[PDB]
Amino acid sequence: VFAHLQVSDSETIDLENLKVYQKVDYSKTAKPLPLYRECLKPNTEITFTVS
RNA sequence: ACGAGAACAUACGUUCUUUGAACCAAGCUUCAACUCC
- Å: A18 CA to B2 C1': 130
Resolution expressed in Å: 3.5
Q: Is the CB of A1 less than 7 A from some atom of nucleic acid strand B?
A: no
- Å: A5 CA to B34 C1': 22
Distance CA A44, CA A37 (A): 17
Would you call A50 helix, strand, or coil by DSSP?
strand
Rg (C-alpha) for chain A, rounded Å, is 17
Residues 6 or more apart whose Cβ sits within 8 Å of residue A7: A48, A50
CA proximity to A10, closest of A40, A45, A47, A50: A47
Distance CA A26, CA A4 (A): 40
Distance CA A26, CA A15 (A): 30
